[PDB]
Symmetry: D2
Subunit: 340 residues, 4 copies
Amino acid sequence: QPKDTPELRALYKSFEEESIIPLWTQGDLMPIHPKSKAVPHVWKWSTLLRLARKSGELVPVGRRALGLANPGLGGNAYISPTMYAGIQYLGPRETAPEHRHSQNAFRFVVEGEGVWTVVNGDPVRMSRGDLLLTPGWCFHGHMNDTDQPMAWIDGLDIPFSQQMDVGFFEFYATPNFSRGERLWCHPGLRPLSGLQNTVASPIGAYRWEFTDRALTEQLLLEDEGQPATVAPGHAAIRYVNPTTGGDVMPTLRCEFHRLRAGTETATRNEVGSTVFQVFEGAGAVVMNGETTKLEKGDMFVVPSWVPWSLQAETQFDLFRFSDAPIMEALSFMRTKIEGQ
Amino acid sequence: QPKDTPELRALYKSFEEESIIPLWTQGDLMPIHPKSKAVPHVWKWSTLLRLARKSGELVPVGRRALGLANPGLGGNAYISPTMYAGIQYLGPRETAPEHRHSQNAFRFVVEGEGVWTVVNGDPVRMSRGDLLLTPGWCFHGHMNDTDQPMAWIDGLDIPFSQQMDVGFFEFYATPNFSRGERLWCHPGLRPLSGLQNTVASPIGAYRWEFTDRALTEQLLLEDEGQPATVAPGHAAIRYVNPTTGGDVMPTLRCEFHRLRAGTETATRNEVGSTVFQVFEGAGAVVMNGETTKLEKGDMFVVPSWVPWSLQAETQFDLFRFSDAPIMEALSFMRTKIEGQ
Amino acid sequence: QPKDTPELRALYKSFEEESIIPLWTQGDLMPIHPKSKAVPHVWKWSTLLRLARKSGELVPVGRRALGLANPGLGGNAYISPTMYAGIQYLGPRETAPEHRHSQNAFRFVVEGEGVWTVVNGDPVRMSRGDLLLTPGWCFHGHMNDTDQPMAWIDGLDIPFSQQMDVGFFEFYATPNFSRGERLWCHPGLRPLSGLQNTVASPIGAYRWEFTDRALTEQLLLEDEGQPATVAPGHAAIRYVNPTTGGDVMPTLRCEFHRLRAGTETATRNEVGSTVFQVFEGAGAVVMNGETTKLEKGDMFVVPSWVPWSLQAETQFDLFRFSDAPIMEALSFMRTKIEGQ
Amino acid sequence: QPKDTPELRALYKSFEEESIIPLWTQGDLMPIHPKSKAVPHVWKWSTLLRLARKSGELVPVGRRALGLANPGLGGNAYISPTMYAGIQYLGPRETAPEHRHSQNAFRFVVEGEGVWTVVNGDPVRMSRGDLLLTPGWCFHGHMNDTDQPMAWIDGLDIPFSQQMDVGFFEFYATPNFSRGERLWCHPGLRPLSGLQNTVASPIGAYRWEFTDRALTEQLLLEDEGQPATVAPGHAAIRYVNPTTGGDVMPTLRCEFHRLRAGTETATRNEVGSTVFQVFEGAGAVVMNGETTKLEKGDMFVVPSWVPWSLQAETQFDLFRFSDAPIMEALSFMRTKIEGQ
Ligand SMILES: [Fe+3]
Ligand SMILES: [Fe+3]
Ligand SMILES: [Fe+3]
Ligand SMILES: [Fe+3]
């Protein structure tokens, strides 16, 4: 736009030299709505499974985590600009020692059992459908107490933490439930020893039973004409820090959704990214108007503001995570729902 | 203290006439520490039981609630300056219709079963050891679905509400658990339909099982050298609003305590008043240095700043309520513990 | 209502003996809406002035505070069930030493100058129109550095504190502004040494200039078609704790109102009590439909739920206090405005 | 680390194909402490001034903002991974129309006067030393009402917002103070029309007078042995949202520091990045042990965890901004101070 003269050419040479970038050569710095580099994308469980198994064979140098890498993120191990999501495959009888990092993490168990993660010394047992938390700066290491492999998903705010410069890092009992649990998993009850609120949840594991039980009660209530479901046919719970009522960790939200056969959700645009895993059943997602059929274990990502919706063919169980707590804490969250 | 002359006598006559009270005739208006009019006092269950039964016979004009009246409160139906506590005796097959008041209330079940309280249309079943809430401004009425009597304690902030000028008042399914429960009583799980925080809990009933289960896990943890108990031998839980982590109602705190045989608590002075009921077991209280032996069902009151302590002879279960949420919300709470 | 037999007469005798009051002899314990014992009432400044002066003569046993006593409160020194309001008359060159109580207090200066209140060692100068705070548990004593009398209003939560059992009590520089002020009275600016939030304000004095300046800018904005005034003609500010944005003290709200000549406010019923003083100008109040004409210095009380409204004859300046922070903190507040 | 065989080579080929990155080829993803790509860097005012002037000549295609670009950020217009900082040079009588974006912004005036920024229709006048806010989603455009150039610094959370996918964007009175100001800039006073808390400040401009006045009172208090300064010789204020007590905008912190001649601050490592501008006086910074001498108008950046300290030769005034509110909101903040 400026007259392209010698004097202007010399101004630009100076800019380059002095680490100045002018804004009138730039516009894309401030878009009309979010326009992620991350792309909607789906990973087929049967693929992730075979490559995780192969890894088990070829790499006893575990540790053995297959990071889902968004194709739009320039080769980084990021499923989105905020979140890492990986499949970790732990072999017969293997272990890891204790470390801590400021990054927040959860481990959601896909299939397997009889593995403990020891969180600040407290052994939390792991099982199909259990969500475990390793909040930032909690020592954690684990041990398989069985000849069997186990596969969980590993969800961290690694990409947020690497880009915002926030990372820090430092370096065999098998009880049936952890201390956290025995203390914190009684509904509406708070131990007088834990009257202090906490930034992350003290619940070590949100066991599948409770999740399943909750979702089913929401479906029964619909049948009985009671308010419960978020949308018709759509039962759903958010995993929460019980000291607070709020999200499990400062950076990550986790939920679980159960759709009744035939249910189709209304299209949402939400700010920030979310990942889903199909825990059980069959159905599809629509992202940017594109339908992708979905089987058990499949995972997919919905970057900021991508219009999305889900359809349950059978009864569709889906575990969910997002960076919504980052967007909400900073007043950046916005939501568009069809017909509202 | 002023020279007692005619002119001074005339000043006072004017004060009287003009509704002025001078402060130099007064001192007791601002005491060194709280000095309640309410007095520590104990009510023997066997007394409350026989008079409740007699009431059942003589008064089918129920409704039939025996208010514990502190001897120091000038004939008012107040167990303390903030709280009402009464025994309500509901007879074979009887009912009450729905009303609401701004005063907050709970009903803690002593012995009986098969009575529902219908809270805003949602029937909450009642049972030995269950705490039910009827938060302020929730419609509530009840029905006995059995030939049997039931006795619960009725705890309200009536005395606070009458003295601070805050009162307002307006005028058969038997399901096993209420909606609130089926929605809210799953540990660490929050329904997406209830992401709004609430001022009082949405848990209709805190059932005995959970309370018992929690307390027992705290005792087992002590045995195993884990932190859990508030004090050695002293297990304890606070009943909480799960949206928030905080107290059940804005004005009332409820807790439940379980002391291991032989445990003696350290003497506390706490600001505000508290009531205890012995749910199970035997032991004593010390209030103002005076030991009173205690049997199952006995109730007692500890006015603001009265030094108190409890001793478990057998294993001592005790349900608790207080006005602590009023003191804490207004920054008035103070605590003295022996050896701290 | 029960059949009046011997056996019933014997039940009642037992009740009396065992400190039981049955609820079916009672109803008035839970009213349709608040029905205070406190009565609306007005005190004429010229009365309060002459009796304060007389006190100055007859009682050098100062200290010399004339408590406004509501006629409905059974002889207690309470202007309402929550608040004390008194006129303190400090004579030529007199002083008081330092004490503290948990009760919260302010001193609003009516006429006078050149008196300091020393709040935790920090001398806060006092002047016509200044609101000073002595938050609960802050040491405070004062000194007149002039041959002149001064009269301020003394507002405390004494009645709340005596009835709820919350009271505790323990036993010459003249700088132009206090430390608090020099630190805290710069708009939108917070000292890095005071990043901790506080329960009561650290502003020692809210000087008249700022109050006057604020109110006048709200009136000028109305003239210019800008939003500012709360109601048309009605300018108004709340005094606030700057660490927090909220009320000055946990128990007391203070505001200042300026009505343009001719303005009549809409009738309000508000829960809890409020006191007003006419700082400047002439007008009337309507309480329970009864109009009382009002001159400079006059004070009046509006108990919980009494319908009230104000009319400015000239431009009507009015200082305000209430127990609203107690009602709001406990979710007891309700408001009815005419035409809304 | 795995045996480099055909079968392993084939596993990797699959990874590439399926958008899987394994974590055992990676480590740098989770560093011992933050290790920014952004580099500490200094921009000399006299450079920024001459290039801004040149821009004024060569580019009447304004708009005319010179973005400070960190040398470590791969050619992006980011002074840090969270913040943009630019010099905007507005020429004789020029203007911009109204737009809004979700990104948060301030404009801190370096030299100039008689320019208004119109924030949601409210004209805020601009002047040497004034901080103005254009919080996210507030319409803003401006106009120079004078023949003179003006230069301000333009601080936005553009880099955070572009990387986290949060951006949205939509498309002559000269009063002496804005409405916001006339309403909000009275110390400890809150208009009854603005009892709602706000996420960003409603103060349009934090004028130099108040900042200067505050800082000077903190220095006078030190002289008088009163607590005020954060560190000896170091006076300082945080700009704050008065509804809340907290930071001006959800994403950006602003402060102003005044060091007494000779003062040297203790070395800090803080998480997240900060920018400083020298408003007045002379001195140096030490970043990573490297001393850089500093003149009036110079700007410098301290990425996450870079040890930094400042030395005042004369009396050293410095305006400050950071992403600390992002770190604090997400529990990521950590601080190391020498000798603590
Ligand atoms: Fe880890
Ligand atoms: Fe009732
Ligand atoms: Fe006092
Ligand atoms: Fe802009």
